[PDB]
Amino acid sequence: STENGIIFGNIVYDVSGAASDRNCVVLSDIHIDIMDYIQPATCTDAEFRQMWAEFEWENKVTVNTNMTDLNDYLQHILKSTNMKCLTPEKALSGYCGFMAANLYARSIFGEDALANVSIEKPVHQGPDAAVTGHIRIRAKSQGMALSLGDKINLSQKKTSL
Amino acid sequence: MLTKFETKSARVKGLSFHPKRPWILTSLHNGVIQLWDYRMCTLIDKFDEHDGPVRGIDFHKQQPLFVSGGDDYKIKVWNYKLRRCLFTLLGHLDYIRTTFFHHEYPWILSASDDQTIRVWNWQSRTCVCVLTGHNHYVMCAQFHPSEDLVVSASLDQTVRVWDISGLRKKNLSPGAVESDVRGITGVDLFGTTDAVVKHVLEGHDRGVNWAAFHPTMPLIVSGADDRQVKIWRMNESKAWEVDTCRGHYNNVSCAVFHPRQELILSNSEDKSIRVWDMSKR
């Protein structure tokens, strides 16, 4: 509880200089992010598609670039955000695949977020060590939504924070 | 390098920057007093001190507190931090421009925009000082070099410099040679705001918007109710010191010294801030 709508937290906080102390720390937080919050959540595909289109379209971020195949990479990202890819078609996340992966999640304060990311995928002189897949992010406010696309973008790779 | 935050609003007569904090406390004549402890781009509080206008802002001198003045005519000191009112007296027939805090017996000075300013004992109850020598409507009231020596700027077209006492105003002296306040080539006029020859300096320049002091010094840097903002040094007292500070188009509401910077910053009304030296000027 306690709604405060100061998004991403990052709200000023006080420790005060009020006694053996002349100053102290006033701080705003940072360090308060999304990837964690949302839990995986699920859907019927036809309805899904319909829905996918239907949803708050308004955010997307791109996937392109990493350190891994989207097998290990995808798993890693998935676990990191604690979120769902709804369903496979065996077409094949292996030989290429030339697979677009649909992901859904529902959070602790209940937003459902929808993705279709469509991605190249690693494999010798076939394709995938980048993507150039587009991550399409729908979350109700664009501001969190895009931000989520980012957040995930942060999540995507593994490097010096 | 960066102008971190910027929205044009507020119609601002009185102003102060936190010598300790990156606060700006701002007085509008919207009737508003505001403290924003400017750092986190956030206002702590905002009280429109009364229905009438607000001209004054001054420091208590401590760390984070305001002493405030409105057309209420009241000296309030309220601590933002402690969100409470320290000791209270209202004001005469005009608002409070400057304040200083002292403490033999935790003791107090209040500087005012009207008539008198009175300095009060709430401990071993006696009189430290009485200041008469103001009339109405003080634009910029000031502590001097000696902090508890002072200057005031008026819409009564005078300037007052006063001498105080621990039992009201007086000074004892007998050694000097000539004076720069008044004693050789050039010098600017007395005004009338009080009635003792300390120096009441002429605040006529259609009236004086601001007065600013030179710490050990008596040079003043001024805002004036003339295009002419006229600069005088009473640590010299030049001729072509009958300087009118000139825009292109009208005014020079103020022009000011920056403690550190040996410079003058001018600001005016053709849509402008005008840039001035004062190191070689």
Residue to mutate among A4, A10, A11, A12, with most B CBs inside 10 A, is A12
Region label for A86, one of left (φ > 0), alpha (ψ between -120 and 50) or beta (otherwise): alpha
Q: Looking at beta carbons, which residues of chain A come within 8 Å of B23?
A: none
* CA A63 distance to own-chain centroid: 11
- Using an 8 Å Cβ cutoff, are B72 and B86 in contact? no
Region label for A152, one of left (φ > 0), alpha (ψ between -120 and 50) or beta (otherwise): alpha
Which residue's entry shows tokens 């971020």?
Answer: A61
Tell me how close the Cα of A58 comes to any Cα of chain B, in angstroms. Answer: 28
3-state secondary structure of B76: strand
- Using an 8 Å Cβ cutoff, are B85 and B78 in contact? yes
Residue to mutate among B40, B44, B79, with most A CBs inside 10 A, is B40
| Rg, C-alpha atoms of chain B | 19
Q: Looking at beta carbons, which residues of chain B come within 8 Å of A28?
A: 40
Tokens of B275: 């840039």
Task: Identify residue B175 by its one-letter amino acid code.
Answer: G
Q: Give chain A's length.
A: 161
How far apart CA B89 and CA B120 sit, in angstroms, is: 10
| Closest by Cα among A53, A35, A31 to A43 | A53
Tell me how close the Cα of A4 comes to any Cα of chain B, in angstroms. Answer: 16
Tokens of A78: 């998935």
Burial B145-167 (b: 16+ CB within 10 A, else e): eeebbbbbbbbbbbbbbbbbeee
Mention every residue, 6+ apart, whose C-beta is less than 8 A from residue B211: B139, B140, B141, B142, B151, B152, B153, B159, B203, B220, B222, B223
Tell me how close the Cα of A22 comes to any Cα of chain B, in angstroms. Answer: 9
Q: What is the resolution of this structure in A?
A: 9.2
Nearest CA in chain A to B42: A12
Mention every residue, 6+ apart, whose C-beta is less than 8 A from residue A20: none
| Rg, C-alpha atoms of chain A | 19
Which residues of chain A approach chain B closer than 8 Å at the C-beta?
A: 12, 22, 26, 28
What are the phi and psi torsion angles at B40 (to 5°)? -85, 30
Mention every residue, 6+ apart, whose C-beta is less than 8 A from residue A66: A73, A129, A130, A131, A156, A157
Method: cryo-EM
How far apart CA B252 and CA A115 sit, in angstroms, is: 60
In Å, how far are B40, B42, B44 from B37, measured between CA atoms? 7, 6, 6
On the CB side of B32, CA atoms within 13 Å amount to 15
Which residue's entry shows tokens 């001198």?
Answer: B61
Angle at A98 between CA A97 and CA A103, to 5 degrees: 95
Angle at B230 between CA B225 and CA B236, to 5 degrees: 145
3-state secondary structure labels for all residues of chain A: CCCCCCCCCCCEEECCCCCCCCCCCEEECCCCCCCCCCEECCCCHHHHHHHHHHCCCCEEEEECCCCCCCCHHHHHHHHHHCCEECCCCCCCCCCCCCCEEEEEEECCCCCEEEEEEECCCCCCCCCCCCCCEEEEEECCCHHHHHHHHHHHHHHHCCCCC
Q: Looking at beta carbons, which residues of chain B come within 8 Å of A23?
A: none
Paired with B42 in beta bridges are B37
Residue B60 CB coordination number (10 Å): 18
Question: Is the dihedral angle over the CA atoms B222, B193, B18, B62 positive or is it negative?
Answer: positive
Paired with B56 in beta bridges are B69
